[PDB]
């Protein structure tokens, strides 16, 4: 399984995930109305928002987390 792990206006980077990590994630962390930090990666289980600023989505196919 191949996930996005970083993105810019110039393109994406991807990784082929560790064995046993069969989900891709995208995670938004809200900082101010105009701006949110966003991270992307492989995961074993769908990360749980531990903060109210956090929004996560997960999926199971190649590069699905863009």
Residue numbers in the entry: 1 to 66
What does the paper say about this structure?
The three-finger toxin (3FT) family is widely represented as structural motif, mainly in the Elapidae snake venoms, supporting various biological functions. This fold is characterized by three adjacent loops rich in β-pleated sheets emerging from a small globular core containing four invariant disulfide bridges. Despite high primary structure identity, often greater than 55%, muscarinic and adrenergic toxins exhibit distinct pharmacological profiles and clear functional differences. “Loop grafting” has been used to construct seven chimeric toxins to dissect how the affinity, selectivity and functionality for the muscarinic and adrenergic receptors depend on shuffling loops between various toxins.
On the other hand, the mode of interaction of MT1 with muscarinic receptors is less precisely defined, but its selectivity profile for M1 and M4 receptors has been clearly established (review in,). Based on previous data reporting adrenergic effects of MT1 in tissue preparations, the ability of various MTs to interact with adrenoceptors was investigated, showing that MT1 interacts efficiently with mAChRs and also with α1A- and α2B-adrenoceptors. The comparisons of loop 2 from MT1 and MT7 shows that the backbone of this loop is conserved between the two natural toxins, but the side chains adopt a different orientation. Another invariable is that the backbone conformation of loop 2 is well conserved between MT7 and MT1, although the sequence is not. MT1 superimposition onto MT7 by least-squares fit shows large deviations in both the loops and in the sequence-conserved disulphide-bridged scaffold leading to important differences when the main chain atoms are compared (rmsd MT1 vs MT7 = 3.22±0.01 Å, depending on the molecule in the asymmetric unit that are compared). A better match can be obtained by not matching consecutive residues but only the secondary-structure elements. Secondary-structure matching (SSM) for the MT1/MT7 comparison leads to a value of around 1.34 Å where the matched residues have a reduced sequence identity of only 66%. The affinity of MT7 for hM4 is very low (pKi: 4.87±0.06), approximately 40-fold less than that of MT1 (pKi: 6.50±0.04). Equilibrium binding experiments with [3H]-Prazosin show that MT1 and MT7 toxins interact with α1A-adrenoceptor with relatively high (pKi: 7.21±0.16) and very low affinity (pKi >4.7), respectively. The tip of this loop is relatively independent of the rest of the toxin in MT7 but in MT1 with the longer loop 3 this is no longer the case.
